[PDB]
Amino acid sequence: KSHTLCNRCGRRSFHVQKKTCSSCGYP
Amino acid sequence: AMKKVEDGNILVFQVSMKANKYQIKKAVKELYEVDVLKVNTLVRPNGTKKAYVRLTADYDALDIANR
Amino acid sequence: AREITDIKQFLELTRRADVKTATVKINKKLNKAGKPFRQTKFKVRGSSSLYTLVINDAGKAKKLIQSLPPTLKVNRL
Amino acid sequence: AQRVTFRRRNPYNTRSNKIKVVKTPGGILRAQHVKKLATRPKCGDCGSALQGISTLRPRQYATVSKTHKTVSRAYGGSRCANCVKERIIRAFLIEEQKIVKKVVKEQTEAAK
Amino acid sequence: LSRYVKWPEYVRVQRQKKI
Amino acid sequence: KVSKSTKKFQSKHLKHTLDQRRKEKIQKKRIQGRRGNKTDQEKADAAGTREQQQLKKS
Amino acid sequence: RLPSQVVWIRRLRVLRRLLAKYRDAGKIDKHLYHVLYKE
RNA sequence: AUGCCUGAAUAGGGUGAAGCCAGAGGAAACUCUGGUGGAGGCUCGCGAAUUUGGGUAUAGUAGCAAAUAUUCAAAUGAGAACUUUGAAGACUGAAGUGGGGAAAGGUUCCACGUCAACAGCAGUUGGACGUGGGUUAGUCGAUCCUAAGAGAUGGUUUCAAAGGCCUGAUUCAGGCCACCAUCGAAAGGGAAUCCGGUUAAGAUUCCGGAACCUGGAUAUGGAUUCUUCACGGUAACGUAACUGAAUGUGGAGACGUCGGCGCGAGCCCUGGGAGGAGUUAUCUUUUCUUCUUAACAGCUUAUCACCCCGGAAUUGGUUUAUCCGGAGAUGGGGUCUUAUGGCUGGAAGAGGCCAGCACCUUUGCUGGCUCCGGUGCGCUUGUGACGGCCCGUGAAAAUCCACAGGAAGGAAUAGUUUUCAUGCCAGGUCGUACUGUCUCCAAGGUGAACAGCCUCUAGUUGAUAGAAUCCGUAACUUCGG
RNA sequence: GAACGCGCGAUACUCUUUGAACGCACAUUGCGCCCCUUGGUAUUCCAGGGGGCAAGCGU
Numbered sequence: 042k043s044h045t046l047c048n049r050c051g052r053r054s055f056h057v058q059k060k061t062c063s064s065c066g067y068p
Numbered sequence: 069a070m071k072k073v074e075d076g077n078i079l080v081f082q083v084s085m086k087a088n089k090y091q092i093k094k095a096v097k098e099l100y101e102v103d104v105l106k107v108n109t110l111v112r113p114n115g116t117k118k119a120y121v122r123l124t125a126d127y128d129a130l131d132i133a134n135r
Numbered sequence: 136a137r138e139i140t141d142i143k144q145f146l147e148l149t150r151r152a153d154v155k156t157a158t159v160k161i162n163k164k165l166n167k168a169g170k171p172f173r174q175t176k177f178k179v180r181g182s183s184s185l186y187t188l189v190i191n192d193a194g195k196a197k198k199l200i201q202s203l204p205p206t207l208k209v210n211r212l
Numbered sequence: 213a214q215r216v217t218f219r220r221r222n223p224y225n226t227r228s229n230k231i232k233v234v235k236t237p238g239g240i241l242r243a244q245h246v247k248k249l250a251t252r253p254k255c256g257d258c259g260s261a262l263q264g265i266s267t268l269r270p271r272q273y274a275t276v277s278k279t280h281k282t283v284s285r286a287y288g289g290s291r292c293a294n295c296v297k298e299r300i301i302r303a304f305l306i307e308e309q310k311i312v313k314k315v316v317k318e319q320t321e322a323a324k
Numbered sequence: 325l326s327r328y329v330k331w332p333e334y335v336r337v338q339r340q341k342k343i
Numbered sequence: 344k345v346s347k348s349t350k351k352f353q354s355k356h357l358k359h360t361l362d363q364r365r366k367e368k369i370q371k372k373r374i375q376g377r378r379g380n381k382t383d384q385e386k387a388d389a390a391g392t393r394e395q396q397q398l399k400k401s
Numbered sequence: 402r403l404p405s406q407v408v409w410i411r412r413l414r415v416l417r418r419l420l421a422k423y424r425d426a427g428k429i430d431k432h433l434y435h436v437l438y439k440e
Numbered sequence: 441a442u443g444c445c446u447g448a449a450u451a452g453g454g455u456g457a458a459g460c461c462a463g464a465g466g467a468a469a470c471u472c473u474g475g476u477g478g479a480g481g482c483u484c485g486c487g488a489a490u491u492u493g494g495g496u497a498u499a500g501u502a503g504c505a506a507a508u509a510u511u512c513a514a515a516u517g518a519g520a521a522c523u524u525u526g527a528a529g530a531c532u533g534a535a536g537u538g539g540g541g542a543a544a545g546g547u548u549c550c551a552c553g554u555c556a557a558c559a560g561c562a563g564u565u566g567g568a569c570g571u572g573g574g575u576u577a578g579u580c581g582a583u584c585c586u587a588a589g590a591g592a593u594g595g596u597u598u599c600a601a602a603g604g605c606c607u608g609a610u611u612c613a614g615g616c617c618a619c620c621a622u623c624g625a626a627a628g629g630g631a632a633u634c635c636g637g638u639u640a641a642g643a644u645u646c647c648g649g650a651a652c653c654u655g656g657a658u659a660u661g662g663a664u665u666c667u668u669c670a671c672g673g674u675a676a677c678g679u680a681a682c683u684g685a686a687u688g689u690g691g692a693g694a695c696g697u698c699g700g701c702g703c704g705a706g707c708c709c710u711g712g713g714a715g716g717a718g719u720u721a722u723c724u725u726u727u728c729u730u731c732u733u734a735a736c737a738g739c740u741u742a743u744c745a746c747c748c749c750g751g752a753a754u755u756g757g758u759u760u761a762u763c764c765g766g767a768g769a770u771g772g773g774g775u776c777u778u779a780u781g782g783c784u785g786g787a788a789g790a791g792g793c794c795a796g797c798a799c800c801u802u803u804g805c806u807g808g809c810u811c812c813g814g815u816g817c818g819c820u821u822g823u824g825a826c827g828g829c830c831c832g833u834g835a836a837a838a839u840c841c842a843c844a845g846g847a848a849g850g851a852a853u854a855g856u857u858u859u860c861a862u863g864c865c866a867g868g869u870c871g872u873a874c875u876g877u878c879u880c881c882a883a884g885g886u887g888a889a890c891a892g893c894c895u896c897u898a899g900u901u902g903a904u905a906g907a908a909u910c911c912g913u914a915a916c917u918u919c920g921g
Numbered sequence: 922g923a924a925c926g927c928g929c930g931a932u933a934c935u936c937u938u939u940g941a942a943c944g945c946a947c948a949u950u951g952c953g954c955c956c957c958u959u960g961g962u963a964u965u966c967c968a969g970g971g972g973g974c975a976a977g978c979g980u
């Protein structure tokens with residue numbers, strides 16, 4: 042469960058600990 | 069829902085997801101010309117909002133349903 | 136709920152403008168002497184509480200029944 | 213011999229949620245959550261429990277009259293009787309010592 | 325303490341240039 | 344009758360507690376026969392005071 | 402059955418109760434009562 | 441490897457350290473005997489190791505996917521070892537194969553229809569397929585607050601012009617104050633809801649009854665007693681009220697762990713009686729089961745602590761535990777907190793257990809009883825006064841209250857205040873169905889040595905199938921009066 | 922570009938929630954301030970609608 046939904050792109054790539062997206066870089 | 073209408077004096081409606089209890093009470097009062105005692109809202113799994121509107125004892129819910 | 140002991144307070148409560156009905160409840164129960172008796176509870180609710188007057192005397196209860204307003208709905212038991 | 217459990221969201225045996233077991237008018241055992249006990253107000257000088265002041269939760273003091281949370285004496289409701297007595301005696305003696313010291317200074321500077 | 329707050333930076337600079 | 348806390352401890356913590364106790368016993372037995380394990384007070388006694396050290400030098 | 406502490410507590414409590422009752426009744430004065438208390 | 445914040449757990453048996461009490465020896469010091477008390481690098485089931493949640497830093501062959509035990513009759517169905525009902529046998533045995541939760545999953549919950557595929561045989565079954573139904577909150581959580589830490593502004597308050605308030609016959613002048621956004625806990629802090637009933641599937645949410653919390657505007661009664669912010673008691677303190685600015689403080693929130701003692705409630709045990717069920721070849725006043733009282737509200741109720749009198753060695757009081765007294769003991773008389781019990785309202789009208797009378801049907805009507813007690817090295821839980829040890833005097837903030845202070849205001853056809861009483865109105869958004877690495881509840885009998893064996897309530901019958909200490913003595917020995 | 926809905930956006934075969942994304946936060950459909958207006962007894966309360974908020978003593 043290291044990743045969650047990203048608001049900007051909709052993928053399961055939002056790292057919960059880092060608070061950054063590994064697919065689109067949000068934010 | 070029709071059982072609730074017949075017995076509990078409760079009209080069951082589907083409402084928008086952007087409406088609160090104040091707006092539902094006001095809308096029922098304006099559209100159907102009845103006095104609302106209470107409003108209880110829930111959010112259904114399919115993304116829609118259901119409201120139970122219990123009217124005051126001065127009004128019969130079945131009469132409004134037939135109307 | 137609240138318990139009252141004053142009969143005239145009960146009558147004043149039953150004389151208010153916004154009063155729906157009054158309940159008269161009968162209970163058959165024993166006293167400390169063992170002789171059974173009839174106890175009458177007069178219950179009427181005010182604004183936010185239910186006041187109960189308990190009367191263990193049959194005659195006093197009958198007089199209170201007679202003294203109730205004729206326009207007051209009375210629930211027997 | 214009926215088993216009961218919590219009635220709220222918390223499933224852990226924390227201080228916040230504590231359970232008592234009561235027999236309801238239905239003839240069954242059921243759980244009930246108990247609130248935290250109130251603490252007696254304490255004196256601001258010695259820390260002893262204040263006498264004559266009701267013990268309530270912090271927000272329950274806002275709904276009771278002033279006689280239930282004060283004492284008619286000075287500092288009543290904040291300090292106890294003995295502390296007030298010591299304060300009075302100490303203040304008076306300090307004032308007397310100030311007067312005596314001022315007289316002594318006046319005398320010792322009066323030589324010149 | 326730190327009383328320097330009584331003078332804003334521009335006032336302090338324009339008085340320093342005076343000296 | 345066994346108490347509730349005893350039941351919970353024996354079901355949860357008994358095994359690892361016993362294992363740790365055995366490990367401490369084994370380590371103590373192994374270190375007892377070795378040389379070079381002395382407490383701070385024992386080492387302080389062995390070194391001695393400044394006067395004792397100056398006497399030992401002399 | 403009953404452990405040592407429970408029976409000791411009961412014995413000491415009943416002995417002290419009897420001593421206090423006897424002193425209050427006047428059968429024993431302060432000093433004999435004080436000796437019997439420690440004994 | 442070392443941390444830090446906030447929770448859960450840190451149990452049990454044995455042994456018996458200081459200190460204390462009473463005896464015996466000696467001039468003391470000191471040594472023995474018994475009890476008490478209940479401690480630890482005590483035991484039992486340079487190096488290794490040292491519970492846990494959340495948060496946060498440095499070939500039609502092998503073989504049947506293994507978790508035991510099934511049998512008889514009936515029903516449904518084209519078809520039954522596998523579906524359904526009844527009977528029999530067996531299993532889990534409160535540390536559950538029992539009832540809930542956090543996280544996670546996402547319709548798996550319920551009904552109807554179906555067996556093309558899936559559930560390694562079959563299936564009429566389903567956590568499958570198709571169509572529908574289902575989750576209701578002022579009171580339960582989130583929402584609010586801050587913790588370790590993170591992070592904008594000019595690295596975390598720093599050489600930042602970083603902001604609010606008050607006074608004034610109209611003159612824009614004057615004055616006060618200091619210090620940094622924000623995020624971070626569904627286990628921490630926190631205002632308030634209970635009982636009964638109800639569905640195919642929803643409940644502290646719906647229904648019936650009953651009650652609280654917060655905020656607001658206002659009216660009435662009473663008080664504010666000569667007209668202007670009330671009294672009583674030596675005192676602790678009591679009260680239906682009984683104004684209070686700047687400013688300065690105090691309390692609750694709010695805080696380590698262990699031990700025994702006292703008290704309350706739930707469970708267990710148990711006597712009588714009033715019902716119902718089982719067994720009864722013989723015996724058995726016999727075995728099982730019902731006899732319940734919620735939140736909330738009124739009256740009353742306290743160990744500790746404190747106050748007044750009094751002035752003590754012939755030293756007294758006193759705890760299971762040796763501490764207290766001219767720094768005022770013993771004794772006598774009072775004050776307080778309401779924790780917790782008792783009575784009552786809620787409330788018997790509810791629920792429970794019975795019996796009788798109605799019908800191819802929602803087919804519900806009536807009548808009784810729901811009472812009185814005891815017991816504790818028992819289990820669970822809360823609480824009070826103590827004692828021991830470790831230690832920053834043992835997280836912070838939101839929030840509520842109080843005290844010092846004396847600014848200001850108050851009277852003649854409604855003076856000022858309304859922490860006294862009654863009365864009116866309102867309470868938004870999101871989660872709630874179902875299951876379930878951390879967590880909650882927890883009966884009895886035998887064991888007479890934690891263990892193991894058997895059962896009550898409640899759940900199962902799942903797994904391809906068929907064939908081959910104990911007998912005789914004596915002294916003693918418990919509570920009161 | 923994404924999410925949710927009927928090529929399109931509640932006017933859905935005008936333009937919802939977002940996104941450089943802009944009132945503040947954000948893994949919450951969470952929390953504010955300002956102006957106008959309307960309704961429910963209404964000067965106070967509650968709610969609905971519309972529109973917004975990324976001086977110096979130097980000369």
Ligand SMILES: [Zn+2]
Pocket residue numbers: 255256257258259260291292293294295
């Ligand atoms: Zn004090």
